[PDB]
Design a protein around this motif. Structure first.
Motif: not given
Ligand SMILES: CN[C@@H]1[C@@H](O)[C@@H](O[C@@H]2[C@@H](O)[C@H](O[C@H]3O[C@H](CN)CC[C@H]3N)[C@@H](N)C[C@H]2N)OC[C@]1(C)O
Ligand SMILES: [Mg+2]
Length: 267
Positions: A223-234
């Motif tokens: 969950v945390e790895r996805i969210a961090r990647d998402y928030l860096a890209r969006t």
């Protein structure tokens, strides 16, 4: 000065909460800071911000879930099974580790509560009954759960000072991802069925790490790895609510991203 309801409504509107929205909040009350009437102030502001046609959904769980005590057993151990309280949706308190605000949400008048003792969801608003049921053992966060309906209903995630590990809806991405080696857990819950206590044993996807590499406790999960990647890209609306740095996330967008992310990494 402590924050008033009217100030938090204004901030929620600046961030992008509209009348009629369907919102799942994750809140760090420490970040928010002092509130006119304690946490009820922020509950009140949320309700007003979504208006009489909007809906709130919260992951509240159950303070006394016997999850650890029954984890990995084909039946509850005997000490547990004789004395453990049955899950009573009207009276069972929320799990305090997922946020102290959730006990205020669940006791709000008209709040509906889902039947899954460990994954229990509370909902306020005109669509609350439709959101919270069914919620069956074996379908904690995946298809047929309240999370699934929230995703079909244009849900927004409101992170009020909470970290990227707090995004419960991303367990839906874990449930449905076509990846090898997914972890499963077996556990037992005590339900109340026609006034009588019944233990039900089920298995479901492991919500504490879907693959061995995400399952360390020390230890970012998927969950945390996805969210961090998402928030860096969006591009995501960001701003303060009370004293807390807050984000408003399109839930369907972040789950779709999560499914792709998992499927792109695991064969
Ligand atoms: C109320 N029972 C809960 C049970 O539902 C479950 O809780 C997990 C929770 O540990 C995870 O979150 C926790 O662990 C994460 C890394 N493993 C980091 C975030 C932390 N809050 C959530 N992402 C999913 C919940 N169902 O496992 C822990 C527990 C306390 O027994
Ligand atoms: Mg409606």
């Amino acid at each position: 000065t402590p924050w008033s309801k009217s100030e938090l409504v204004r901030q929620l509107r600046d961030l992008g909460v509209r009348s009629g929205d369907m919102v799942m909040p994750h809140v760090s009350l420490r970040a928010v800071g002092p509130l006119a009437d304690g946490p009820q102030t922020l509950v009140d502001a949320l309700i007003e911000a979504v208006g009489p046609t909007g809906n709130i959904l919260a992951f509240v769980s159950w303070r006394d879930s016997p999850y650890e005590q029954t984890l990995g057993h084909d039946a509850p151990p005997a000490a547990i099974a004789q004395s453990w309280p049955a899950f009573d949706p009207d009276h069972a308190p929320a799990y305090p580790g997922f946020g102290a605000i959730n006990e205020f949400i669940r006791t709000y008048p008209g709040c509906r509560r889902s039947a899954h003792p460990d994954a229990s969801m509370a909902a306020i608003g005109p669509d609350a009954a439709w959101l919270v049921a069914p919620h069956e053992m074996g379908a904690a966060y995946g298809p047929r759960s309240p999370i699934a309906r929230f995703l079909a209903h244009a849900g927004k995630i409101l992170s009020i000072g909470a970290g990227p590990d707090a995004v419960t809806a991303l367990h839906y991405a874990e449930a449905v991802a076509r990846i090898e080696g997914k972890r499963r857990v077996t556990y037992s819950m005590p339900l109340l069925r026609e006034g009588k206590r019944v233990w039900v044993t089920t298995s479901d996807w492991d919500s504490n790490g879907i693959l061995d590499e995400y399952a360390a406790p020390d230890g970012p999960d998927a969950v945390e790895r996805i969210a961090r990647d998402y928030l860096a890209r969006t591009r995501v609306a960001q701003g303060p609510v009370g004293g807390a740095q807050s984000r408003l996330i399109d839930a369907a967008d972040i789950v779709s991203f999560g499914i792709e992310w998992l499927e792109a990494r695991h064969a």
